Design a protein around this ligand. Structure first.
Ligand SMILES: Nc1nc2c(ncn2[C@@H]2O[C@H](COP(=O)(O)OP(=O)(O)O)[C@@H](O)[C@H]2O)c(=O)[nH]1
Ligand SMILES: [Mg+2]
Length: 169
């Protein structure tokens, strides 16, 4: 019985949700991907020598204009909450997404990873590693730093780690 893991990528506009998801599925960096296009992606893949189907929603735009958002939020098996280390507001807003997930899933905790994207940027970085890690510690969830830019950092690891969390819960 091959399981499906339905994964939902959430976070403020501009943090790199699309770039990360495209890097994962297509192994290329696509800059400035249409900000409002919401795509899902489905593939069989092997993680830690166990096959699964990943059904991934790259969220975009307003929930009230999305055909698929409601079902993915309600039935998702795990979430990536992404912020950009160059956008302090996107970091602050992690709390909004965290609350939203726990409200919709109606649980005290739920599989999720905190993803600090754009760590290839140094001068523009406004959120420190320690700020990210403390937030993850507060929520009792894993923390990972990523870059979707070539060569990508921790992109496969992020999606795989979310699957690992779902399997470990
Ligand atoms: N330097 C850098 N820029 C990135 C990275 N990921 C995305 N971007 C850029 O950040 C902007 C927003 O990315 P996008 O994937 O559209 O974010 P989304 O709105 O969350 O889907 C675009 O200009 C991207 O080219 C990254 O890891 N590093
Ligand atoms: Mg996008």
């Amino acid at each position: 019985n091959l399981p499906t893991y339905k994964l939902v990528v959430v976070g403020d506009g501009g943090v790199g949700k699309s770039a990360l998801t495209i890097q994962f599925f297509q192994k290329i960096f696509v800059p400035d991907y249409d900000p409002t296009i919401e795509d899902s992606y489905l593939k069989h893949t092997e993680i830690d020598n166990q096959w699964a189907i990943l059904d991934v929603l790259d969220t975009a735009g307003q929930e009230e204009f999305s055909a698929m958002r409601e079902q993915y939020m309600r039935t998702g098996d795990g979430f990536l909450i992404v912020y950009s280390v160059t956008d302090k507001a996107s970091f602050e807003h992690v709390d909004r997404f965290h609350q939203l997930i726990l409200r919709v899933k109606d649980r005290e905790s739920f599989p999720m990873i905190l993803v600090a994207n754009k760590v290839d940027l140094m001068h523009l970085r406004k959120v420190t590693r320690d700020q990210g890690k403390e937030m993850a510690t507060k929520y009792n969830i894993p923390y990972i730093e990523t870059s979707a830019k070539d060569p990508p950092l921790n992109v496969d690891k992020t999606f795989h780690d979310l699957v690992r969390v779902i399997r470990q819960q």
